[PDB]
Amino acid sequence: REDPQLLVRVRGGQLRGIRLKAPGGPVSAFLGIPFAEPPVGSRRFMPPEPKRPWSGVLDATTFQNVCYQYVDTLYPGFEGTEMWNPNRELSEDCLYLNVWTPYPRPASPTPVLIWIYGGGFYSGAASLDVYDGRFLAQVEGAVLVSMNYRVGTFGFLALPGSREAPGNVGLLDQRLALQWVQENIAAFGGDPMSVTLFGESAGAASVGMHILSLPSRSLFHRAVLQSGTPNGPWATVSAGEARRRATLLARLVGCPPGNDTELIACLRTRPAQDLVDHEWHVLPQESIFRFSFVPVVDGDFLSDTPEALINTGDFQDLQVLVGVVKDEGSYFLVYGVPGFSKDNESLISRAQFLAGVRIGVPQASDLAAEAVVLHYTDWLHPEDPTHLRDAMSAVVGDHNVVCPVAQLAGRLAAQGARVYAYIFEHRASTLTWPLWMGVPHGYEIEFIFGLPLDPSLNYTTEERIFAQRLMKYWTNFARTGDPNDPRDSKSPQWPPYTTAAQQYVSLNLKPLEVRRGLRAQTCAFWNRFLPKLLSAT
Amino acid sequence: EGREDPQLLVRVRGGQLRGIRLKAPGGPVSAFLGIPFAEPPVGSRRFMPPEPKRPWSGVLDATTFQNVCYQYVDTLYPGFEGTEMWNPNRELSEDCLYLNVWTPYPRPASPTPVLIWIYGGGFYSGAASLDVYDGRFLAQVEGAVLVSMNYRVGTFGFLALPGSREAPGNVGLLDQRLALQWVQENIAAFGGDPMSVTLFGESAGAASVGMHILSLPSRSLFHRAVLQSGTPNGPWATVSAGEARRRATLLARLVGCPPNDTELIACLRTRPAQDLVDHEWHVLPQESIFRFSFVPVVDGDFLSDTPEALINTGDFQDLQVLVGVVKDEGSYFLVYGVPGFSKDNESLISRAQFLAGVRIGVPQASDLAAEAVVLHYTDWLHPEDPTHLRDAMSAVVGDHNVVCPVAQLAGRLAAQGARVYAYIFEHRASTLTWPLWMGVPHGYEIEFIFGLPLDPSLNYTTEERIFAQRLMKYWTNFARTGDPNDPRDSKSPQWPPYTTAAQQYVSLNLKPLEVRRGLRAQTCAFWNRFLPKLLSAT
Ligand SMILES: Nc1ccc2c(c1)c(-c1ccccc1)[n+](CCCCCc1cn(CCNc3c4c(nc5ccccc35)CCCC4)nn1)c1cc(N)ccc21
Ligand SMILES: Nc1ccc2c(c1)c(-c1ccccc1)[n+](CCCCCc1cn(CCNc3c4c(nc5ccccc35)CCCC4)nn1)c1cc(N)ccc21
Ligand SMILES: *[C@@H]1O[C@H](CO[C@@H]2O[C@@H](C)[C@@H](O)[C@@H](O)[C@@H]2O)[C@@H](O[C@@H]2O[C@H](CO)[C@@H](O)[C@H](O)[C@H]2NC(C)=O)[C@H](O)[C@H]1NC(C)=O
Ligand SMILES: *[C@@H]1O[C@H](CO[C@@H]2O[C@@H](C)[C@@H](O)[C@@H](O)[C@@H]2O)[C@@H](O)[C@H](O)[C@H]1NC(C)=O
Ligand SMILES: *[C@@H]1O[C@H](CO)[C@@H](O)[C@H](O)[C@H]1NC(C)=O
Ligand SMILES: *[C@@H]1O[C@H](CO)[C@@H](O)[C@H](O)[C@H]1NC(C)=O
């Protein structure tokens, strides 16, 4: 006997899902659905091709392979690093998606939530414990979709203008999963006419790039950008910079033994790990929060720079939820700034702070880095190691996340979008990173996905109530484009972010608190002053 | 003699003097007003260093104030007390090198600490005869010997053709140095202690005090110093030899003198004093506020290097300094040249009027530097709010010109061995006629330090009279000991020395002393550390 709730016919054929246990009851999971032809051999660096139909019933009960990527070995065996690392076999044959739906399958078309993972476009997988759609599906009755997209050289190595390596193919893999949803989600009880994209870090940048690319705009209705944006210093590169890095890596892998075709063909003959081995050696400077192969401003997927597109685009019929964590740049420091460690309090000297600023803002001139140091120094306690340590974290998170987010929020708002902004300030009771790291980058995700609801994970009762609140904000947003509950009449209400009032809310254990101005003075420094300083260079 | 008051007859190196017995609220004071300290700097002596006054015969009458040095008379708000109080109160003349002395009546039996006042007025104006500089209260109430002198201002005191013999520049500073030498020689005749001389001044007067700190020949003439809302460093207190040469040459052209220096200077000497005054303001390089045409020059003589170089490298080990600012240093300057500003309206300005004003307020700033200023002083929550824009314009002028040069000075002096005490004067006189938006303007602490509230006829409050008394004690305890704290009083909040480590200063208001940390620390790091690096690279 077969469970009819576990049998779905999609355009490509039949699938068999698995009944999964969530705290409050069962869910139907369809894991490892292929959405594209495996991008192997001659297909490496090429745009994805739709998956060909299959015979019989395809087993969709387990997560599929994780896209070929670099594996972090900074703190081996440490939960804090390991949780972000591949949890399935690495393979170039990784173009699969996952679907979680209520059990039984909803009777009416249900709003769809599509998750796009982060990991600096060099890493990530939709199989990670913190991306588990189980809770959202069970508790909120949502149809949750997550896909794997190619990362690193495989997803973003580009020789701009070539046919064989046009770049942005990882973004195309995501666009193909979005098309798959339009064509097949109704078979799972999902509403193709109510699709919300959500992502964190590189995932949030990806969401933004789908907002700014016209062929993606017909595939979703609302968007959520958690601690990431399409604009900013790390999310994109120029055609020139991508060409430079691709040519250098090819040179590094003894490739060619000339023409775009010749070079790409020889890169295709190379074992996956050979490309990963040299991936990090193509960065122009010693840096942090910089990734070798990221989306390219090609004049195709991205018709112009995200900055140009956000300044001139029409976002009238768009709803966006944007926000940041309390300590965006804290973890980045243990990956390359001398004096920083997870194992000590990381109390730094002034000299170490100045050195760290050159690493944190690698594009900055001597004058620009001096402007940064002078702005982030506490002139009452300018040598205080704690202030210097926290100022170093603030430099990295403001430059890379907070102020690009502030910039996106403002431009979207001014150009017709309905924007809701937040600051996530709750540190998980379960967190293993030091106290000095505060609420690091990515540690709100487990709360949005509702992991505290699993009693085995040992979160507090308040954290379980808080996770439930977040799941409601996110799904009310997916449902209506407003994170506020239409039933709840004693709130306080989450107001839209506007250029005039600059209103955002604090997300913590306490009830919603409304704040105005997202690091307004400091972001005027990054967004208004620093460009004028580098434009007169 | 024989029938005169024997307490009013004193001999100085120059000859005999007759003073006057004045009434102070608490009792009488001796006053010796209009004592000549130099040969009248007229004719061929115009632009020349002062010469010591030759001895006179008979009893020189020292019962009235003497002539005010030739200067521009402010006609912005005619008949208005707010402007008029700063204006000459005696006849204008180039024969103005006179000093005043106030002592207790009867004269002290033992050597008394001396306080020497140096007036402000952007080195273009001022007089030691102004009501707010009245030494009678300090003399009566604190038993102090108070001296104030006239020094040449404008072209007469500071027009220089650097390197020339006929117009070397800084002669107004030399007039001040000559009055300090006069005190060393003659103050003991009035009961004053030449071995305990404290200089005090406000605005250009405070800058003058600082220049005496930085000029070795003045250092032997005083022991302690008070710099109220002014410093030798900063954008307005000095000019380069090049800039002074440019302005003197242009002024000569504007009055009919065609440029060799001897010929030029000789011609300038043939010109009516009023003709120079009528063209004084036309030599400024840009439309500006808080900029004065003829100020001290970096000559490599009086000033061996720039005040900035001198404060960064000097040894101040055996020096005690009292420094401070008022709450609204730049507020009044805006009604003298920033469009949208008036004493008669609330001065609520637009963003465009703020951007325009920043260019007038920071005239030496490039487009990028002016942009850095605007971005720093804008409230990005309410960037178009007229009240914030108005107050930000005042803060730009006050911080650039006073607060941050003062902060720079306090830090450098402290790091280089000086004993520094810093303050913020936040009390607005109940009697003030300037609008409320101006807050505590530049120079409105003076009347409190001099103890004018003690005169009941001036209609100050009882709290203001108690407050004036507190200030007079801080200042005179500082003059006496180099510490503004009373050794008799105990908590009685202590005024701590300002240090690089703790950056401690006090609030001077009607409430008891409150200790604060950092003098506009973030903002002054912008002006003192960042902006120079922006103009050194662009
Ligand atoms: N082997 C080798 C050789 C040379 C270099 C490098 C590696 C690396 C490097 C890249 C990744 C991990 C470790 C090291 N960097 C890059 C260093 C910058 C930091 C990159 C980085 C590393 N990670 C970790 C990813 N995992 C996490 C993720 C998230 N949160 C987290 C919170 C805590 C800890 C880890 C988290 C949320 C989003 C998902 C990823 N995120 N960004 C270089 C920079 C140069 N200029 C030169 C040479 C190298
Ligand atoms: N006739 C004419 C022609 C051309 C110009 C000017 C005048 C003037 C000008 C100077 C003084 C008064 C009125 C106008 N400036 C303005 C520059 C300086 C004005 C700033 C100033 C004015 N005052 C008044 C002096 N008295 C005061 C003093 C103090 N506080 C005060 C508080 C309120 C009112 C007056 C105060 C502190 C102590 C000393 C003097 N002190 N500083 C120009 C700037 C240009 N760029 C170009 C041309 C001119
Ligand atoms: C904080 O730690 C860093 C890293 O040191 C490592 O982690 C420590 C907790 C401990 O296990 C050390 O032995 C490890 O080396 C310190 O910086 C390094 O210090 C070592 C000497 O101990 C030196 O050889 C390395 O070059 C340094 N590396 C870097 C990146 O700076 C740092 O000094 C520690 N800070 C404090 C406040 O103690
Ligand atoms: C304030 O005043 C400025 C100067 O205008 C003059 O003074 C005012 C008080 C009137 O008497 C007027 O007739 C004079 O011309 C103006 O430039 C400025 O715009 C005014 N600001 C406001 C907010 O009213
Ligand atoms: C939760 O706590 C219990 C009891 O201490 C422990 O046995 C269990 O392993 C913990 N679970 C996790 C996920 O750490
Ligand atoms: C003091 O007050 C009286 C009474 O109102 C008034 O006539 C006099 O002119 C005032 N004097 C001053 C200096 O304000």
UniProtKB/Swiss-Prot annotation, chain B:
Q: What is its EC number?
A: 3.1.1.7
Q: Molecular function terms in GO for this entry?
A: acetylcholine binding; acetylcholinesterase activity; collagen binding; identical protein binding; laminin binding; protein homodimerization activity; serine hydrolase activity
Q: Let me know which tissues express this protein, per UniProt.
A: Predominates in most expressing tissues except erythrocytes where a glycophospholipid-attached form of ACHE predominates.
Q: Which UniProt keywords apply?
A: Cell membrane, Disulfide bond, Glycoprotein, GPI-anchor, Hydrolase, Lipoprotein, Membrane, Neurotransmitter degradation, Secreted, Serine esterase, Signal, Synapse
Which one GO biological process term can you cite for this protein? Answer: osteoblast development
Its recorded name reads Acetylcholinesterase
What taxonomic ancestry is recorded?
A: Eukaryota, Metazoa, Chordata, Craniata, Vertebrata
**Subunit structure of this chain's protein:** Isoform H generates GPI-anchored dimers; disulfide linked. Isoform T generates multiple structures, ranging from monomers and dimers to collagen-tailed and hydrophobic-tailed forms, in which catalytic tetramers are associated with anchoring proteins that attach them to the basal lamina or to cell membranes. In the collagen-tailed forms, isoform T subunits are associated with a specific collagen, COLQ, which triggers the formation of isoform T tetramers, from monomers and dimers. Interacts with PRIMA1.
Q: How is the protein disposed in the membrane?
A: Peripheral membrane protein
GO cellular component entries: basement membrane; cell surface; extracellular space; Golgi apparatus; neuromuscular junction; perinuclear region of cytoplasm; plasma membrane; side of membrane
**What is the annotated role of this protein in its UniProt record?**
Terminates signal transduction at the neuromuscular junction by rapid hydrolysis of the acetylcholine released into the synaptic cleft.
User: What InterPro entries does the record tag this protein with?
Assistant: AB_hydrolase_fold (IPR029058), AChE-related_enzymes (IPR050654), AChE_tetra (IPR014788), CarbesteraseB (IPR002018), Carboxylesterase_B_AS (IPR019826), Carboxylesterase_B_CS (IPR019819), Cholinesterase (IPR000997)
Disulfide bond sites: 69-96, 257-267, 404-524
Q: Which organism is it from?
A: Mus musculus (Mouse)
Top-level EC class:
hydrolase
User: One Pfam match, by short name?
Assistant: AChE_tetra
Q: Which reaction does it catalyse?
A: acetylcholine + H2O = choline + acetate + H(+)
Q: Where in the cell is it found?
A: Synapse; Secreted; Cell membrane
According to the record, glycans are attached at 260, 345, 459
Give the encoding gene's name.
Ache
